[PDB]
Amino acid sequence: KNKCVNFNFNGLTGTGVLTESNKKFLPFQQFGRDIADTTDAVRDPQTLEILDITPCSFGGVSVITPGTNTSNQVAVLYQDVNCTEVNVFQTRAGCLIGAEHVNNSYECDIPIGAGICASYQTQSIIAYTMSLGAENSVAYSNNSIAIPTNFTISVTTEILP
Amino acid sequence: ALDPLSETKCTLKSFTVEKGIYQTSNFRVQPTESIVRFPNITNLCPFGE
Amino acid sequence: ALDPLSETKCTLKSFTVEKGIYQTSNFRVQPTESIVRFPNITNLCPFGE
Amino acid sequence: VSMTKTSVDCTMYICGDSTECSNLLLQYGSFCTQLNRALTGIAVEQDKNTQEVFAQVKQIYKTPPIKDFGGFNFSQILPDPSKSKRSFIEDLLFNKVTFNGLTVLPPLLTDEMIAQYTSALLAGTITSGWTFGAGAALQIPFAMQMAYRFNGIGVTQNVLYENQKLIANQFNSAIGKIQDSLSSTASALGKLQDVVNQNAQALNTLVKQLSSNFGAISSVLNDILSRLDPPEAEVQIDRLITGRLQSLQTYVTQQLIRAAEIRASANLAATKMSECVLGQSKRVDFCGKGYHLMSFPQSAPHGVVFLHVTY
Amino acid sequence: GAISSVLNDILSRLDPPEAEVQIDRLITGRLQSLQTYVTQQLIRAAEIRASANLAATKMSECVLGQSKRVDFCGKGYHLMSFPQSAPHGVVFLHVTYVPAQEKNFTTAPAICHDGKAHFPREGVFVSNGTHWFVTQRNFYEPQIITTDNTFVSGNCDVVIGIVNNTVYDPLQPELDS
Amino acid sequence: VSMTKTSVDCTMYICGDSTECSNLLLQYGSFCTQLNRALTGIAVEQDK
């Protein structure tokens, strides 16, 4: 149990993490499938107990890195993988190895996923919550107003293929 | 196979790698050992008789 | 195959049917006869020869 | 605004951890890799749609602590600091919307962060009006803001200042009717329900195709290897490879087509969020029926909701 | 899945009745590649068609004329646009009016001269703490509040937040002259 | 604005009045039904 192992039951075979659960099959039901006809749970033929078929940890191995001219230090992300089945920061998208989690929120430079971003700062790679901009408490009232005293002619570059 | 930095160079086909995130490979936990399960062997044939 | 109400349920895979129109089957007029017409049988082929 | 980021592993789907299948799958060239780059391209595009719509301003604008906006009650649209700060309407918008190598990637911008961008644009339209979308945020009284919004539609400013209590009762009551309709009519979010259900049907249909035979003796690769010899198993396994490969090409083709639909809808919402919400649009019937005064933004699961205030 | 990717190898190695089986695999495989490539190009054609309509819209609306749409031409109030050609595309130089410097002022919906409410005709009333002036919402230009720069309507009791000020009637000093 | 609303039956086109053909076509699964969903989906979109 609790291990990614190949299984060969009475009628069904496959590969996945064998683990128990609180489900209850009927006295005659020997196996179980999800909505899409994929085996999600089984009953052990020997011991009358219910066993969920959790899939083996899978996902893409993404590499977080700065520019080559900046530094050669990098970080790895195992998408949808806990850190116990790969100092190290567990993200909602996966386990981020090689990045120190920083409480201070900075601008998103290297978007990882699920609000998490990274950047090369004082040097090593850091992880932080994605900052959505600088806070600006606009002074509002029923009598105050801001009128612009000067302006700047800005030329914006809009590229459209 | 040296480091994750080199994996990006082989995946992107470029020595210089820009600041960002790139998918280089896939993680797959392989099965440790095949687990065979079958009901207990009851109703034995009368070969011993 | 009970009624058009049931035809929508097995089509949409839903017990509760929503308000609207849904294509459930395909009307196909079945053949009435088994007509097999061939030219006039006058001579028999000489397989004996 | 966005879709469910689903990165389907081309190898795990076609070949369920079968070495004989993978050796034959490599013979098809880069059809496996192209399916991954297409879905990987989509998942990056759904994040771009979220950025072009919600990540519109580089500052997090906050409302003042004193909720005095000239009679306009924004308590039902501003974030609730006690509750993932979301408004009472946003709580309805979130509540009223319902293994084999299919990696469901999360979004870059989380739901709790999407609400912050909407609160920033919402606070900007309330506090700064139409000045924060063009440049530096310039505070204006909301009663003064609406006056020039009335002037932008051919209504002299005196109508507001003489009937400021009327619009306050009409606006506060109009927001109340929205909460009643969203809480009563479950089909109000039918636009986003079709999107999440369409992606769910294609995802579920994609998994159900694994059970299909595609002309093979059996849908399971292990049954073919167990029943037939290696030189005979390669023929039937090829039928499942070419069968399952075309299934991904179908799913990727539909998702790419649906992505263009959501990309166009996201660009539409991007135009509304950038034009109708940030400022006042003279485009007739672009912000809905009636002369457009302003539009307050509201978040939703993988979508966006506009509260178009119309004269 | 064929014995070889080269058609000449199949025709040379295998017999005619056996070569058709292996050649059929390369046909369906290479045909699937074209159906995949053409399917992607038709999809990318929809992407480039959308950006082309946006570029055409952002050309005829932004370059050939002025647009009151916010954020349609770069960032800021649109003044003008100078297009620049590029390989298989176009780059617009959206010139915009971005207010940079600002200063806080005290305003009011109207002013009271003789009991009647005087509203701002084209601009906004402001105050420097000592005197009241009128200026535009997008530029600070102190102007004396006259009868022409305002609008008379209603009374001063109905307007909420109204203040008191003296309106410069140009007929008064001209008639006294 | 609108296109020609077409609903090509996946079964009759591939298997025109053939039960033996249909039994083979069921082995492909949703490759038949999914094409009917899209074609019926287009016809609803042209009305929108």
Closest partner CB to D62 (pick from A92, A135, A145): A135
**Integer Cα distance of E122 and E148 in angstroms:** 10
**Integer Cα distance of F27 and D21 in angstroms:** 20
* Residue from D139, D164, D203 to probe the interface with A (highest A Cβ count within 10 Å): D139
**Integer Cα distance of E111 and E166 in angstroms:** 8
For F37, the token pair is 């969903």
Which residues have CB under 8 Å from E85's CB, separation 6+? E91
DSSP-assigned letter for residue E65: S
- What residue spans of chain D are helical by DSSP H? 10-14, 19-25, 31-53, 88-95, 111-123, 142-151, 158-162, 164-184, 190-208, 221-227, 230-271
**Integer Cα distance of D137 and F22 in angstroms:** 66
**Integer Cα distance of E162 and E150 in angstroms:** 14
φ/ψ of A93, rounded to 5, equals: -85, -30
**Integer Cα distance of E84 and D118 in angstroms:** 34
CB B29 within 8 A of CB A56: yes
CA A15 → CA D160, D220, E176, F15, distances in Å? 70, 13, 102, 37
Please name the residue of chain D whose CA is at the shortest distance from the CA of residue B29.
D17
Amino acid in position C20? G
What does R_g of chain B's alpha carbons equal in angstroms? Answer: 26
Closest by Cα among D81, D83, D63 to D73: D63
Which residues have CB under 8 Å from A74's CB, separation 6+? A63, A64, A65, A98, A125, B3, B4, B5, B8
Residue with tokens 């509304």: D272
Closest by Cα among E138, E154, E141, E46 to E96: E138
Q: Do E102 and A146 count as a contact with CB atoms less than 8 A apart?
A: yes
Which residues have CB under 8 Å from E66's CB, separation 6+? E78, E79, E80
CB E135 within 8 A of CB E144: no
Angle between helices E16-60 and D31-53 (to 10 degrees): 10
Sequence-separated contacts (24+) of B21-24 with Cβ below 8 Å? B21/A62, B21/A63, B21/A64, B21/A77, B21/A110, B21/A111, B21/A112, B22/A62, B22/A63, B22/A65, B23/A60, B23/A61, B23/A62, B23/A63, B23/D40, B24/A61, B24/A62, B24/A63
Closest by Cα among D305, D270, D276, D288 to D125: D276
Cβ-count burial D81-102 (b if 16+ within 10 Å, e if not): eeeeebbbbbbbbbebbeebbb
Which residues have CB under 8 Å from A5's CB, separation 6+? A15, A17, A18, B31, B32, B33, B34, B35
**Integer Cα distance of E126 and C9 in angstroms:** 68
**Integer Cα distance of B18 and D110 in angstroms:** 25
Q: Is E45 on the interface with D (CB under 8 A)?
A: no
Sheet holding E132-136: strands in order across?
E124-127, E132-136, E139-143
Q: To the nearest 10°, report the CA torsion of A117, A118, A121, A125.
A: 150
Q: To the nearest 10°, report the CA torsion of E70, E73, E78, E79.
A: -170
* Residue from D204, D210, D247, D253 to probe the interface with F (highest F Cβ count within 10 Å): D247
Nearest-CA distance from D132 to chain E in Å?
Answer: 9
Amino acid in position D216? A
**Integer Cα distance of A117 and D109 in angstroms:** 10
**Integer Cα distance of D290 and D155 in angstroms:** 13
Helix, coil or strand: residue D57: coil
For A20, the token pair is 């128990």
Give the pairing type, strands D303-310 and E139-143.
unpaired
**Integer Cα distance of E11 and E158 in angstroms:** 97
Q: Do B32 and A67 count as a contact with CB atoms less than 8 A apart?
A: no
Residues 178-207 of D with CB under 8 A from F: 201, 205
Q: Do D205 and F28 count as a contact with CB atoms less than 8 A apart?
A: no
Amino acid in position A36? A
Which residues have CB under 8 Å from D117's CB, separation 6+? A132, D54, D55, D56, D57, D109
Nearest-CA distance from A147 to chain E in Å?
Answer: 6
Please name the residue of chain D whose CA is at the shortest distance from the CA of residue B21.
D44
Helix, coil or strand: residue B37: coil
**Integer Cα distance of A59 and D12 in angstroms:** 10
Residues pairing with A90 in the sheet: A95
Q: Do B26 and D9 count as a contact with CB atoms less than 8 A apart?
A: yes
Residues pairing with E93 in the sheet: A157, E82
**Neighbouring C-beta atoms of residue A4, cutoff 10 Å:** 19
**Neighbouring C-beta atoms of residue A69, cutoff 10 Å:** 9
SS3 string, B4-36, reads HHHHHHHHHCCCCCCCEEEEEEEEECCCCCCEE
Nearest-CA distance from F1 to chain C in Å?
Answer: 23
Q: Do E71 and D133 count as a contact with CB atoms less than 8 A apart?
A: yes
Chain E residues touching D138 at Cβ < 8 A: 99, 102
Amino acid in position D143? A
Residue with tokens 């001209």: E174
**Integer Cα distance of D1 and D6 in angstroms:** 16
**DSSP conformation letters of E46-64:** HHHHHHHHHHHHHHHTTTS
**Integer Cα distance of D138 and E77 in angstroms:** 14
SS3 string, chain C, reads CCCHHHHHHHHHCCCCCCCCCCCCCCCCCCCCCCCCCCCCCCCCCCCCC
* Residue from D21, D22, D49, D99 to probe the interface with A (highest A Cβ count within 10 Å): D99
Nearest-CA distance from B46 to chain D in Å?
Answer: 30
Which residues have CB under 8 Å from A23's CB, separation 6+? A32, A41, A50, A52
What is the C-alpha end-to-end distance of chain C, expressed in Å?
57
CB A61 within 8 A of CB B27: yes
Residue with tokens 């496959």: A14
φ/ψ of A148, rounded to 5, equals: -80, 130
Give the pairing type, strands E124-127 and E132-136.
antiparallel
Helix, coil or strand: residue D307: strand
Burial-class residue E116 by CB neighbours within 10 Å (0-12, 13-18, 19+): middle
User: Please, how many CA atoms are within 13 Å of residue F46, restricted to the half-sphere of its CB?
Assistant: 11
CB E130 within 8 A of CB E120: no
**Integer Cα distance of D9 and D6 in angstroms:** 9
CB A106 within 8 A of CB A86: no
Helix, coil or strand: residue F40: helix
CA E136 → CA D146, D148, E95, E133, E140, distances in Å? 16, 11, 21, 10, 6
**Integer Cα distance of F42 and C42 in angstroms:** 57
**Neighbouring C-beta atoms of residue D178, cutoff 10 Å:** 17
Nearest-CA distance from E47 to chain D in Å?
Answer: 7
User: What is the tally of helices (H) and strands (E) in chain F?
Assistant: 3, 0
